[PDB]
Design an enzyme around this catalytic site. Structure first.
Site, mmCIF file in Angstrom:
data_model
loop_
_atom_site.group_PDB
_atom_site.id
_atom_site.type_symbol
_atom_site.label_atom_id
_atom_site.label_comp_id
_atom_site.label_asym_id
_atom_site.label_seq_id
_atom_site.Cartn_x
_atom_site.Cartn_y
_atom_site.Cartn_z
ATOM 1 N N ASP A 1 0.951 -1.286 0.122
ATOM 2 C CA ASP A 1 0.010 0.108 -0.045
ATOM 3 C C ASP A 1 0.910 1.278 -0.049
ATOM 4 O O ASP A 1 2.111 1.243 0.000
ATOM 5 C CB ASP A 1 -0.864 -0.071 1.375
ATOM 6 C CG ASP A 1 -1.965 1.077 1.281
ATOM 7 O OD1 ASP A 1 -2.582 1.508 0.304
ATOM 8 O OD2 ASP A 1 -2.525 1.269 2.492
ATOM 9 N N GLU B 1 2.832 5.155 -3.945
ATOM 10 C CA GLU B 1 3.061 6.221 -5.089
ATOM 11 C C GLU B 1 4.355 6.802 -5.227
ATOM 12 O O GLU B 1 4.565 6.928 -6.547
ATOM 13 C CB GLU B 1 1.820 7.203 -4.901
ATOM 14 C CG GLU B 1 0.290 6.598 -4.978
ATOM 15 C CD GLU B 1 -0.004 5.519 -3.993
ATOM 16 O OE1 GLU B 1 -0.659 4.590 -4.353
ATOM 17 O OE2 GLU B 1 0.225 5.865 -2.894
HETATM 18 O O1 NOJ Z 1 -3.677 1.014 5.690
HETATM 19 C C1 NOJ Z 1 -4.948 2.188 5.997
HETATM 20 C C2 NOJ Z 1 -5.487 2.015 4.291
HETATM 21 N N1 NOJ Z 1 -4.674 2.832 3.496
HETATM 22 C C3 NOJ Z 1 -5.068 2.974 2.063
HETATM 23 C C4 NOJ Z 1 -5.405 1.678 1.359
HETATM 24 O O2 NOJ Z 1 -5.870 2.175 0.301
HETATM 25 C C5 NOJ Z 1 -6.569 1.162 2.401
HETATM 26 O O3 NOJ Z 1 -6.948 -0.021 1.914
HETATM 27 C C6 NOJ Z 1 -6.195 0.931 3.886
HETATM 28 O O4 NOJ Z 1 -6.951 0.382 4.664
#
Ligand code: NOJ
Ligand SMILES: *[C@@H]1O[C@H](CO)[C@@H](O[C@@H]2O[C@H](CO)[C@@H](O[C@@H]3O[C@H](CO)[C@@H](O)[C@H](O[C@H]4O[C@H](CO)[C@@H](O)[C@H](O)[C@@H]4O)[C@@H]3O)[C@H](O)[C@H]2NC(C)=O)[C@H](O)[C@H]1NC(C)=O
Ligand SMILES: *[C@@H]1O[C@H](CO)[C@@H](O[C@@H]2O[C@H](CO)[C@@H](O[C@@H]3O[C@H](CO)[C@@H](O)[C@H](O)[C@@H]3O)[C@H](O)[C@H]2NC(C)=O)[C@H](O)[C@H]1NC(C)=O
Ligand SMILES: *[C@@H]1O[C@H](CO[C@@H]2O[C@@H](C)[C@@H](O)[C@@H](O)[C@@H]2O)[C@@H](O[C@@H]2O[C@H](CO)[C@@H](O)[C@H](O)[C@H]2NC(C)=O)[C@H](O)[C@H]1NC(C)=O
Ligand SMILES: *[C@@H]1O[C@H](CO[C@@H]2O[C@@H](C)[C@@H](O)[C@@H](O)[C@@H]2O)[C@@H](O[C@@H]2O[C@H](CO)[C@@H](O)[C@H](O)[C@H]2NC(C)=O)[C@H](O)[C@H]1NC(C)=O
Ligand SMILES: *[C@@H]1O[C@H](CO)[C@@H](O[C@@H]2O[C@H](CO)[C@@H](O)[C@H](O)[C@H]2NC(C)=O)[C@H](O)[C@H]1NC(C)=O
Ligand code: CL
Ligand code: CL
Ligand code: CL
Ligand code: CL
Ligand code: CL
Ligand code: CL
Length: 846
Positions: A425, A428
């Site tokens: 996650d 970017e």
């Molecule tokens: O990790 C926290 C949160 N960050 C952004 C992610 O897109 C989401 O799926 C996640 O729950």
């Protein structure tokens, strides 16, 4: 000279608001729109480059391109080299480079006549590509000037029709709008909303041509860029660095165009079989006790679940490669128990590493510092930003040493907790502050002469400084690869740590991502709008070679409703990657948390997906060996039917399974397009109006809350397998065939089977491959390859659709079968057998 039709005006002031006097002073034409369309535009005589010294080689062509009059951007590169490589009969490749200076290039591993011809315009320079068979002009870059300055490249072309798809990642219809649309590729942490640059960037388009042929174009460039579509129709690539490195793929079929593109960027990785089961996650399973309850609650209500996930909850103070000693004190035992019960375990991993802990107290940081694994700033120190743990440094995944450090951290954590893959996650890379704790310097990389239409209006917004230093180059050039490079590093780390196929799910992506990992669509709202938008988006990623893709089932942000979560679970059971995930403050949306009727509908959806898994797996094999799509739009399969071209709220699995979801509240029916053929209602196949005869037409279908419409194309055979709450259990059950006969009694299908997780299966030949054929009231198998892995696959049921008259007898290997049923109302013949997929059989009826 300025008599240029409105739709064919190319913008001569892309960089700033401009007056008539300034426009004319640039040597451009000024004509206001009568009501977007540029007011200041290039005359046909606008200075471009001139082609000189064109010559031919066995490879193709080379030439020099010279610009004589500067553009309005700084640092024009006045002399360029053109190299044209006629690589295969389907693939033409050209580069435009600075012969006096190596420029940044994206790292990427390398009757008889081509399908294309190429010709050149001398002054203004352009490249012209024809389809040989019919003479259609596919590329013509003569339509507008060539710009090649240090931080601004522009190359334009005519398009062959108003129908073009690609250029992820954006929330849009599958077919893009040519109405003066600006599409920005700059990886950005933003919840999917229209008109915005999202988490990934894929500079590839596929363009349809009248009659059903198509071609594709890939610009191998990772810089921040706009792509500008206008209604003439035409397109402009407008990048902020690198070179022009352009591939054209000739198809002619849309599926071939995709396969040809994937030949260059890489074919999809083969997931492990368990990866195709149901995944369940939320932000907020805040202890091992709570997390264990999810599995218990699923199991008690007979909901299949292969893989349990945790979000940030497991970590110690939200740091990678730790687990807290309160709620997650017995994290290792929980994961071992999951495995004991036949399930897998996934957890979130972020890229940024906490930098604020006392020295010597946090190994991933301390070791990273020692080995120099981080992105650095002007003075050579780690760039420090803000993410979940607080102050963080950012790994440089172009540095070989950082690859080795990531391998080590993953292996060491895996020794403590045996997780089965990584959910990557925030890559970017996402930054909670602008650029860094210390801001960013003032230079041309941070403040470039052309800023694409990014959210926030700067390259620094929600991310790190553009002039920060990585091993291969600056972040300016490498930003759109950050996620991809992390996915590559994680794929290798997991291979080394576990010795079996890796399972990586990533937020940020770039072209070629599918070779290493899958993707989910990010922070979608629990809305009917986002449910519907997920269909085009899942289809788009399949066209881009990332078939392991899906959205968060029932939606991530906000609160889902029961009706929405039934419809989302129904459609989402046909996402190739199926995970229900939920945000921290949202109401629960696990299948067992709803009313009994809703539970029943959700259970039915999961059960059907599990029954279909041998077929879904085989589709992934086809993706992996042949560059096929798994979920595909109707137009990929029936491109010569122009009524399919704008359909993106239905989907196919492979060639044969058409899914027509309800995507609106309060609906008890749905209207979907049915291509020419007979389509059997899959509900007429026993799982533990019977047929639509279409001329190519829209059909309104009953679709009560308990139902999703799924139809099987006549001419196809689908392998199925018995039920289980996990793939560990389901893979041991007896199998079945669903045989959809044409009117002439013909059908074909296939099964690919291996051990479900080992590396190098195809290379080692450690798999079984069987073809199924129906013809003249018989069904047989053809043994393409039979190995130990396919041994003992028990076929116990054969269901035949479109049997017009009741049989008097049914034989299996020459012996009347134990029992069969025939329904004159549904034309269905259901046959009980005792056969083996890996042994030649013959079933017949009369
Ligand atoms: O990790 C926290 C949160 N960050 C952004 C992610 O897109 C989401 O799926 C996640 O729950
Ligand atoms: C490259 O990255 C490095 C980090 O790897 C980064 O180092 C940071 O530099 C700033 C200064 O530029 C440091 O901030 C200082 O911290 C000390 C004590 O912690 C303070 O005493 C300093 O206070 C001064 O500035 C104040 C302004 O508000 C004044 O009011 C005060 O009187 C002082 O003059 C200041 O806050 C920071 O701690 C480091 N970071 C780390 C982790 O060490 C460096 O700046 C980066 N280089 C560039 C060009 O950006
Ligand atoms: C590729 O695109 C280029 C640029 O759009 C096309 O070339 C241009 O074609 C137009 C229309 O055919 C030409 O205009 C015409 O010129 C002739 C001769 O002066 C005149 O009789 C017409 O009244 C009209 O004005 C234009 O000169 C030409 N531009 C250039 C730079 O050559 C081209 O046709 C496209 N190529 C293909 C294969 O489609
Ligand atoms: C286009 O090419 C000519 C000639 O190039 C020569 O032949 C080539 C095949 C290759 O062997 C080159 O190395 C040769 O120079 C260029 O004109 C020459 O320019 C040089 C240096 O300016 C000069 O000494 C020669 O006398 C020129 N020869 C001729 C016949 O004019 C020309 O510059 C090239 N054009 C561009 C825009 O690069
Ligand atoms: C999502 O719902 C939560 C919780 O909603 C409450 O409990 C539900 C079972 C139902 O009865 C709702 O009508 C209740 O409101 C919302 O969070 C609540 O927000 C209100 C006011 O904003 C606040 O007073 C409550 O304390 C909150 N309750 C909890 C448990 O957090 C939340 O706003 C909803 N989210 C969105 C985006 O609308
Ligand atoms: C798993 O299911 C159990 C039982 O349905 C849930 O436990 C209940 O939680 C509610 C809170 O809404 C309490 O009021 C009840 O007293 C609990 N019942 C029992 C029998 O313990 C539990 O919340 C569920 N866990 C998860 C993670 O979904
Ligand atoms: Cl003006
Ligand atoms: Cl460089
Ligand atoms: Cl525009
Ligand atoms: Cl062709
Ligand atoms: Cl139509
Ligand atoms: Cl039998």
């Amino acid at each position: 000279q300025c008599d240029v039709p409105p739709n064919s005006r190319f913008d001569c002031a892309p960089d700033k608001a401009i007056t008539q006097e300034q426009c004319e002073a640039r040597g451009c034409c000024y004509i206001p729109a009568k009501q977007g369309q540029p007011w200041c535009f290039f005359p046909p005589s606008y200075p471009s480059y001139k082609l000189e010294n064109l010559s031919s080689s066995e490879m193709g062509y080379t030439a020099t391109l010279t610009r004589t009059t500067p553009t309005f951007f700084p640092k024009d590169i006045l002399t360029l080299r053109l190299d044209v490589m006629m690589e295969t009969e389907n693939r033409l490749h050209f580069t435009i480079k600075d012969p006096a200076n190596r420029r940044y290039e994206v790292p990427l591993e390398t009757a008889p006549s081509p399908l294309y011809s190429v010709e050149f315009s001398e002054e203004p320079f352009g490249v012209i590509v024809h389809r040989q068979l019919d003479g259609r002009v596919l590329l013509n870059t003569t339509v507008a000037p060539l710009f090649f300055a240090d931080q601004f490249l522009q190359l334009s072309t005519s398009l062959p029709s108003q129908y073009i798809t690609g250029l992820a990642e954006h929330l849009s219809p599958l077919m893009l709008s040519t109405s003066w649309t600006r599409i920005t590729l700059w990886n950005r942490d933003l919840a999917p909303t229209p008109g915005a640059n999202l988490y990934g960037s894929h500079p590839f388009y596929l363009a349809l041509e009248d009659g059903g042929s198509a071609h594709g174009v890939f610009l191998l460039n990772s810089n921040a860029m706009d792509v500008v579509l206008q209604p003439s129709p035409a397109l402009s690539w407008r990048s902020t660095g690198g070179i022009l490195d352009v591939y054209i793929f000739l198809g002619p079929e849309p599926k071939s165009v995709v396969q040809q593109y994937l030949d260059v960027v890489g074919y999809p990785f083969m997931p492990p079989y368990w990866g195709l089961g149901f995944h369940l996650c939320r932000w907020g399973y805040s202890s091992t006790a709570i997390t264990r309850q999810v599995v218990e609650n699923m199991t008690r209500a007979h909901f299949p679940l292969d893989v349990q996930w945790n979000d940030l909850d497991y970590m110690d103070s939200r740091r990678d490669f730790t687990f807290n000693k309160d709620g997650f004190r017995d994290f290792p035992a929980m994961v071992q128990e999951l495995h004991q019960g036949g399930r897998r375990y996934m957890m979130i991993v972020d890229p940024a590493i906490s930098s604020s802990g006392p020295a010597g107290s946090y190994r991933p940081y301390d070791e990273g510092l020692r080995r120099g694994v981080f992105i650095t700033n002007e003075t050579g120190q780690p760039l420090i930003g803000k993410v979940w743990p607080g102050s963080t440094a950012f790994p440089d995944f172009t540095n070989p040493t950082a690859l080795a450090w990531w391998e080590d951290m993953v292996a060491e954590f895996h020794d403590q907790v045996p997780f089965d893959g990584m959910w990557i996650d925030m890559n970017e890379p996402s930054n909670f502050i602008r650029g860094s704790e210390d801001g960013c310097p003032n230079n041309e990389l941070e403040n470039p002469p052309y800023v694409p239409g990014v959210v926030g209006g700067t390259l620094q917004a929600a991310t790190i400084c553009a002039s920060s230093h990585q091993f291969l180059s600056t972040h300016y050039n490498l930003h759109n690869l950050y996620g991809l490079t992390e996915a590559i590093a994680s794929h290798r780390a997991l291979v080394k740590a576990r010795g079996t196929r890796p399972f990586v799910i990533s937020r940020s992506t770039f072209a070629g991502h599918g070779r290493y990992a899958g993707h989910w669509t990010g922070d979608v709202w629990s809305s009917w709008e986002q449910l519907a938008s997920s269909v085009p988006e899942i289809l788009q990623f399949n066209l881009l070679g990332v078939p392991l893709v899906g959205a968060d089932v029932c939606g991530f942000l906000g609160n889902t409703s029961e009706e929405l979560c039934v419809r989302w679970t129904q459609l989402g059971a046909f996402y190739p990657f199926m995970r229900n995930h939920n945000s921290l403050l949202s109401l629960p949306q696990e299948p067992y948390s709803f009313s009994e009727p809703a539970q029943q509908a959700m259970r039915k959806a999961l059960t059907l997906r599990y029954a279909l898994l041998p077929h879904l797996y085989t589709l992934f094999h086809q993706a992996h060996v042949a560059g096929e799509t798994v979920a595909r739009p109707l137009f990929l399969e029936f491109p010569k039917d122009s009524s399919t071209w704008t359909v993106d709220h239905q989907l196919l699995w492979g060639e044969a399974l058409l899914i027509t979801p309800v995507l609106q509240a309060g609906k008890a029916e749905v209207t979907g397009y049915f291509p020419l053929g007979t389509w059997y209602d899959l509900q007429t196949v026993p799982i533990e109006e019977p047929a639509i005869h279409s001329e190519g037409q829209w059909v309104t279908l009953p679709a009560p809350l308990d139902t999703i419409n799924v139809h099987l194309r006549a001419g196809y055979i689908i392998p199925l397998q018995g039920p289980g709450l996990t793939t560990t259990e389901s893979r041991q059950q007896p199998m079945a065939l669903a045989v959809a006969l044409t009117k002439g009694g013909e059908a074909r299908g296939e099964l690919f089977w291996d051990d479900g997780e080992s590396l190098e299966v195809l290379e080692r030949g450690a798999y079984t491959q069987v073809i199924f054929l129906a013809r003249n009231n018989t069904i047989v198998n053809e043994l393409v390859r039979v190995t130990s892995e396919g041994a003992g696959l028990q076929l116990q049921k054969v269901t035949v659709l479109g049997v017009a008259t009741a049989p008097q007898q049914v034989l299996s290997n020459g012996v009347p079968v134990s029992n069969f049923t025939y329904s004159p109302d549904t034309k269905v013949l259901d046959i009980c057998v005792s056969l083996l997929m890996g042994e030649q059989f013959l079933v017949s009826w009369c």
